[PDB]
Amino acid sequence: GSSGSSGMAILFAVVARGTTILAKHAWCGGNFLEVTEQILAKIPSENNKLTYSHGNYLFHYICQDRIVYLCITDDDFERSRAFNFLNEIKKRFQTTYGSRAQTAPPYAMNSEFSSVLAAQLKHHSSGPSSG
């Protein structure tokens, strides 16, 4: 009996082009890079989105400029919210680290982004109960 239900908000969120992960940054909890990587290898590179309900969760992925933005969220969590946040950072990445995302090597701009995302996540939702 080990269940924890408190404040449902985005926890995992990384950016990868097809199957190559550039900048990854998720909350300290478990291993999501596993299910995520597997899903990525399944998601095409063509501009198209779709809601994938895996592991009793919702995997919202938005393909753009050969970049896939996946994020793990609770079922209850609304879609608009998920898609929203993703769009925010998504545009921020392609706007700032966009060009590099096409040239720059993998795990190159993970630091800079890692921090940026962390802020967006903590802000978006008051998971840690911060204000």
Q: Which domains does the chain have, with CATH numbers?
A: 10-125 (3.30.450.50)
Beta bridge partners of 58: 53, 73
Solved by what technique? Answer: NMR
Residue type (1 letter), 63: C
Distance CA 93, CA 40 (A): 18
Spatial separation of the C-alpha atoms in residues 11 and 100, rounded to whole Å: 25
The beta-strand segments (E) located in the chain are: 12-17, 20-26, 49-54, 57-64, 67-74
Instruction: Tell me the backbone φ, ψ of residue 30, rounded to 5 degrees.
Output: -140, -150
**Alpha-helix runs per DSSP H in the chain:** 33-40, 79-96, 98-102, 110-124
